[PDB]
């Protein structure tokens, strides 16, 4: 673990109350995030041992995700370097809250959503403002550019952001920083396809590739437009390739790999 400076305490700190943390520490408990001098602190009055400090200097990305009718509002921190987290470690920490006469009932559901969205949005801007000489901006998922896919087991929506491609609605969290990407390869694209798979190769060849599987064919051209828009070069093929073999070969002699034309072998 990379060493982190002590949090410097701040008058009363800006606060977001009644908030849960993911990944979860003991039992899941409601908590409280406070903005301080050089970072933020999470803690709960119901688990009085717990404390999670994150410095502005260790925040690579800050995301605000309003209720996209998954009945959850999220503020997400993608960290530069992982930090100790109970007896484990994490590179992502997020704070969330879930939603908990028909005319007036819907009035109230609407009010509750707007309330949570306002509280979380406001706090997110306060974090960016307080950590602004570290250059922090609030980034947000782009709803109309989202597409379905399976990066783990369950079908989830993956959203492009200004700098990233994320899935933070449910664990395991995915935050791909686009500038880290070397190449993308589209698998099982063939006449009559129902869905296809997307593979990300990173500029660091020791980093494992990321599979986003089972993307509906309705989203095939949209993903390509996304890749082009992100200046990520790509290829496509009918087969699922063995990336263990490929990345093993590449990491052994990357200089010869690029003298041989690099990822062009994926392009016929």
Q: Where is the binding site, in residues?
A: 106, 109
**Contact flags string 14-33 toward Ca ion, x per CB under 5 A:** --------------------
Coil, helix or strand at residue 118 = helix
**Of the candidates 151, 144, 186, 181, the residue with the CA atom closest to the CA atom of residue 169:** 151
Helix (H) or strand (E) holding 245: helix 243-252
Site string for Ca ion, 109-128 (x = CB under 5 A): x-------------------
- Compare residues 109 and 225 and give the one whose CB is closer to Ca ion: 109
Among the candidate windows 74-82, 103-111, 208-216, 235-243, which touches Ca ion by CB under 5 A? 103-111
CB 158 within 8 A of CB 212: yes
Q: Closest separation between CB of residue 113 and Ca ion, Å?
A: 8
Q: How far is the CB of 109 from Ca ion (least distance, A)?
A: 4
CB-count exposure of residue 84 (10 Å: 0-12, 13-18, 19+): exposed
* Nearest distance, CB of residue 106 and Ca ion, angstroms: 5
Taking contact as CB under 5 A, which single stretch among the options 22-30, 70-78, 106-114, 240-248 is the one that binds Ca ion?
Answer: 106-114
For the beta sheet containing 72-85, the strands, ordered from the edge strand earlier in sequence to the opposite edge, are: 47-55, 39-44, 31-35, 15-22, 88-98, 72-85, 59-65, 138-139
Q: What is the dihedral of CA 228, 230, 231, 232, to 10 degrees?
A: -80
Distance of CA 164 to the CA centre of its chain: 8
Q: Please work out the total of residues on this chain that contact Ca ion, with binding judged by CB under 5 A.
A: 1
Q: Given the rule CB under 5 A, which of 11-19, 56-64, 105-113, 181-189 is the region that contacts Ca ion?
A: 105-113
> Which run of H or E residues covers position 212?
strand 210-216
Q: Which is nearer to Ca ion, 5 or 109 (CB)?
A: 109
Ranked by CB distance to Ca ion, the top (closest) residue is 109
In the complex, the smallest distance separating the C-beta of residue 188 from Ca ion, rounded to whole angstroms, is: 38
For Ca ion, which is the closer residue by CB, 99 or 193?
99
> Which residues lie across from 89 on neighbouring strands?
84
Q: Is 108 in the site for Ca ion (CB under 5 A)?
A: no
Q: Which stretch binds Ca ion (CB under 5 A): 108-116, 145-153, 194-202, 223-231?
A: 108-116
Binding site feature residues for Ca(2+): 106, 109
C-beta of 97 vs 185, nearer to Ca ion: 97
Q: Is the dihedral of CA 170, 174, 178, 183 positive or negative?
A: negative
* Positions that interact with Ca ion (CB under 5 A): 109
């Amino acid at each position: 673990v990379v060493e982190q400076d002590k949090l410097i305490e701040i008058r009363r700190p800006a606060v977001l109350d009644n908030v849960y943390i993911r990944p979860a520490l003991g039992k899941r408990v409601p908590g409280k995030v406070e903005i301080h001098q050089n970072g933020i602190r999470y803690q709960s009055p119901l688990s009085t041992t717990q404390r999670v400090d994150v410095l502005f200097s260790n925040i690579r990305h800050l995301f605000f995700q309003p209720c996209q009718n998954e009945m959850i509002v999220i503020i997400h921190l993608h960290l530069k370097d992982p930090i100790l987290f109970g007896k484990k470690k994490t590179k992502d920490v997020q704070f969330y809250r879930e939603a908990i006469d028909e005319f007036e009932a819907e009035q109230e559901e609407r009010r509750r959503k707007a309330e949570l969205d306002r509280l979380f949005k406001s706090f997110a801007e306060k974090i960016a403002e307080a950590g602004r000489n570290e250059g922090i901006e609030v980034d947000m998922p782009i709803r109309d550019l989202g597409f379905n896919g399976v990066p783990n087991r369950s079908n989830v929506v993956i959203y492009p952001t200004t700098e990233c491609l994320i899935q933070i609605t449910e664990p395991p969290f995915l935050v791909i920083t686009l500038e880290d990407v070397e190449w993308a390869h589209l698998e099982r694209v063939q006449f009559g396809l129902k869905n296809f798979d997307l593979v990300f190769v990173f500029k660091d060849f020791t980093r494992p590739v990321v599979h986003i599987n089972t993307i509906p064919v309705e989203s095939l051209e949209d993903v390509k437009e996304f890749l082009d828009s992100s200046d990520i070069p790509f290829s496509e093929g009918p087969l699922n390739l063995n990336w263990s073999v490929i990345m093993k070969t590449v990491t052994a002699n990357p200089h010869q790999f690029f003298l041989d034309g690099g990822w062009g072998f994926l392009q016929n």
